[PDB]
Amino acid sequence: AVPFVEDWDLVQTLGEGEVQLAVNRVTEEAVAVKIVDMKNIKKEICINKMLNHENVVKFYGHRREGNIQYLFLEYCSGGELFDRIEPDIGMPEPDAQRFFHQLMAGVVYLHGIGITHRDIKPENLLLDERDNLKISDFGLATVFRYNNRERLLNKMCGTLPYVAPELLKRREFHAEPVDVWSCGIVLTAMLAGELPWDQPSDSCQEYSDWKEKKTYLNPWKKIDSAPLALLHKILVENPSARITIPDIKKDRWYNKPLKKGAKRPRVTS
Numbered sequence: 001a002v003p004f005v006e007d008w009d010l011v012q013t014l015g016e017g018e019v020q021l022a023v024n025r026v027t028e029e030a031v032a033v034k035i036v037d038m039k040n041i042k043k044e045i046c047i048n049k050m051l052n053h054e055n056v057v058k059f060y061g062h063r064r065e066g067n068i069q070y071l072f073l074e075y076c077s078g079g080e081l082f083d084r085i086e087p088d089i090g091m092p093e094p095d096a097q098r099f100f101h102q103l104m105a106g107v108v109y110l111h112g113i114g115i116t117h118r119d120i121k122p123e124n125l126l127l128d129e130r131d132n133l134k135i136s137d138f139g140l141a142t143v144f145r146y147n148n149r150e151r152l153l154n155k156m157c158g159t160l161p162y163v164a165p166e167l168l169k170r171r172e173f174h175a176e177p178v179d180v181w182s183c184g185i186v187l188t189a190m191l192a193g194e195l196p197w198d199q200p201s202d203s204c205q206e207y208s209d210w211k212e213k214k215t216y217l218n219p220w221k222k223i224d225s226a227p228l229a230l231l232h233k234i235l236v237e238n239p240s241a242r243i244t245i246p247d248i249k250k251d252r253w254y255n256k257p258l259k260k261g262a263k264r265p266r267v268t269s
């Protein structure tokens with residue numbers, strides 16, 4: 001129709017190791033472009049095409065163009081949740097709770113369509129212009145439920161400080177409790193500004209201390225009673241005993257009023 005509308009200028013590197021910010025030549029609309037020097041990606045695309053939720057990074061499409069693939073996704077101008085966490089401090093409890101509510105909404109959605117993310121951590125949780133959290137990076141994601149039949153997972157996948165202990169100790173495991181566990185580690189990080197262990201193994205002193213309930217120690221001592229009681233229910237070694245999302249939604253801290261709305265209208269007299 002209108003000429004030039006399909007043209008995008010790549011104006012800035014968002015992340016690399018690449019993701020570029022693309023701006024439409026005509027409309028100035030912004031999108032994030034992931035550029036892969038194809039020489040998993042097909043899985044990330046196939047999974048993204050299935051996704052449509054306010055707390056999940058929107059997928060717009062892809063272009064093959066030889067061997068270099070282009071993935072067009074929602075631009076999230078607030079950046080990574082990771083950058084909102086102050087080292088050794090965390091963030092205000094009300095903000096952590098709101099981000100945690102949004103994270104649970106995104107995860108409930110994914111699990112509802114039979115998808116597990118498998119790599120939930122603050123680097124993969126993006127923020128839009130209004131600080132709305134959006135789960136990103138579906139490169140390690142997989143279908144754990146198909147035709148109403150659950151498939152148990154067995155592949156080692158994720159990021160050590162965030163992985164559930166059963167992934168290190170058992171040959172097979174249910175997908176859902178693994179994502180619940182990593183959300184508990186993200187919550188800990190938001191409230192203490194530190195990760196509690198390098199990995200959840202008995203050989204790891206910090207992990208043993210947690211299982212012994214030594215909450216007078218570091219990251220736990222910085223966390224208030226209410227959210228700490230929720231963490232005691234999420235970071236449970238046995239995944240069959242671990243709290244499920246429907247029960248997280250019933251938790252006292254989860255439902256505690258703490259945070260005011262965005263705030264915008266203000267004039268007196």
Ligand SMILES: NCCCc1cc2c(-c3cccc(O)c3)c[nH]c(=O)c2c2cc(-c3cn[nH]c3)ccc12
Nearest residue numbers: 014015019032034073074075076077079123136137
């Ligand atoms: N783990 C983060 C990696 C880097 C990364 C990926 C993405 C993807 C995106 C695109 C394709 C695949 C994918 O996994 C994520 C989609 N949308 C983004 O906005 C975005 C992004 C935005 C910022 C930023 C810094 N200031 N303001 C925004 C920084 C790093 C980013």
